[model samples]
Target: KTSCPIKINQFEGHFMKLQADSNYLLSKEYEELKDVGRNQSCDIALLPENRGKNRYNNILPYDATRVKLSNCSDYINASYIPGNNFRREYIVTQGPLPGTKDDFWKMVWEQNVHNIVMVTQCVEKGRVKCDHYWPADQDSLYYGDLILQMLSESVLPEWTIREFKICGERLIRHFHYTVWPDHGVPETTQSLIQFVRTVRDYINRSPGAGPTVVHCSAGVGRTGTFIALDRILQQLDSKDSVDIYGAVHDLRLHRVHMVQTECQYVYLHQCVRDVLRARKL
Candidate 1:
């Protein structure tokens, strides 16, 4: 339970001090955090059969916490990321490769996942960031032994919500956020905060005790950033304090490169600052 604690009242001041000196100290902090989790082993991810399942060669999930599919291939580029209280709070995973889409759904069904939060678009800058794993409007797609049917879709400016039915019995919700760019932060923190709130609202209302699935392209940068935001926001509501660095570090220990960029690190602070401001604190 490592943490760098900052009371809500002092976060803005703390952010100001780090923002000084041309962000020199902040850069050093991110570098230090990156180094702490650099030595963890990913033996399973490196196995010959599992090599092709990973979207990137360098970014791999820690072997100890990697999600193992029970009924199918046991490997997927995914890790079970813990929240403050729950051990299996969220499963952060890579966007489905063309060949691994079936495995993706298999994990969802096996894990009893109720909601999926996708922070990256399928195509970005003409590059295929993720494969479109769902069926078209009013259709169903088969992935392994599971059948996913699109029940409804609601599109908004910053995000879209789609309802899904699995195997004609279970229901799942997908939150697709289209604003975030690859390896970059969003244009505005408010949009992301709102999006996180929307996703959390659904999760709070949904039934079942399944871990929420979250992913981007490689499931490190934006995926980690989004999970950190969710965790910190929940902390603010209950603990009145936030551990951004600790939260990010904990995530990296589970999977490499959580909060993958210095820019994204700074954005987390900015989000906390803005959120506190909204509270009129």
Candidate 2:
């Protein structure tokens, strides 16, 4: 991981206060974000089998976040989450399944996606989680009209970064955090934060690079955690006052089950304090 941007001790005592405040605020909105369908029509999502094609991984109605594929036919399982002050749009999704693999790439092509952040492994804890979505070599792999050819890959302790040339179009960058451990945080914030910073740095260099796609097993827990941390750090860098709870609340409104667990919620608090502490000096 990149050198620790900030010392860990400076803001050590500050996290507990932030955690308590965010914990209280989150409880007030938990019922709404979890079960209540305030924004999207949950009724239509339950109507037909075709509508169900747009969903992948876990295939449940509760915590499964659904994304609309704009003008396209029913194909992909992805959500377009608009960004606030911190960053650009992120299309949060589940790892593509065998049946929905083509749909996944179709959405990537249609959206002109420039970056992908994967937060889950292909298989975890003796169960198949997400389908293996991309190719290993320079040879192009076709998913309908879309084609992906791996250009280069850089592997780190907590994540892997890959560049893929697509359909003779532009290149697509994939950030795969391989060791996030299902339902848990990374061992240390440094590695994951470095990965986020690297991803953000590349995206910032190209303002109109299009929406970045981020996913995990169910597209809620680790997916939400990755998005939240990235946005919070960007806010800090912009010298703006940050609110982890408010940011996650905005996310859940767009999709569902963001910052999926209290463990993750508290983890966000800790990472924010880390960033604040690092920048403190």
Candidate 3:
């Protein structure tokens, strides 16, 4: 169970924020099945992102924030095959059309809402996003002016923030209401895949976009689990034999821990296994 960087129980709570249909902690069985194979221990390389020594976790003074807005978000430095049709299409959620990549890249820095994602990866690499999460529980006139400033900016801009820390900057991004499944891990692997597909697409479209940033507070176990498990599924589909829990375990080895709760590991594993079985992949 502890052979790799991440573990089974780390991702329990955050799954509720995405979908509510999880079969609940089935991934826990992997521990007992350890003597048996199918769970690849060294399959996935532990990422520097989860390590404290990594540079991405440290914020630098010269660090600049560039805004981006893109229509068609496909592709990445990573080698995952680009799926032609997304899990589910939303007319409202449509990024930019195919022909818009160039223009989208040209002007994306201005049109879409903005937020901050650090270039480095580490224990607390989290950067502040929209104040919406904490706006005095109401609107303010000063906030309005800030909004106007954002709207008036041009594309690919290196925004002129005189004092990022002193001035108290703000960041923003779109939300996936559909992905939030009440209060449990999602049951179907399809929903989990759909959610990941959206994230991958988002990262691809945003060129300068850094390592995908997601958090539910502590930024410890679940964050590590999410990344490890996702990468694991990608590897497994390629017939590498490394399932999601194995992937998470690889992560746990480096971070000193991956998941804190047993339920999370089980849930991540069940979802990935279910997806594979459904696709016959």
Scored by lDDT, the top model is: 1
Model 3 stretches astray by more than 4 angstroms: 1-184, 237-239, 254-257
Model 2: weakest 10-residue lDDT segment is: 1-10
lDDT tens per residue, model 1, 40-153: 789888999887898888878888889998732689989999987797999999999989999999888889999999999999989999999988787777887788899999
Two-way TM-score contest, 1 vs 2, winner? 1
- What are the per-residue Cα lDDT tens digits for candidate 3 across 57-90? 2211111111223321321111111111231111
By descending TM-score, how would the candidates be arranged? Answer: 1, 2, 3
The TM-scores of all predictions, comma-separated, are 0.96, 0.82, 0.41
Please report, as a residue range, the 10-residue window in candidate 1 with the lowest summed lDDT. 31-40
Give, for candidate 3, the lowest lDDT window spanning 10 residues.
75-84
Cα misplacement distance, residue 223 of candidate 1 (Å): 0.4
* True-structure lDDT of candidate 3: 0.33
User: Which residue ranges in model 2 land beyond 4 Å of their true spot?
Assistant: 1-14, 18-39, 51-67, 70-72, 86-88
Listed per model in order, the count of residue pairs whose N, CA or C atoms clash below 3 Å is 0, 2, 30
TM-score of 1: 0.96
- The candidate, 1 or 3, that scores higher on lDDT is 1
Error of 1 at 204 (Å): 1.0
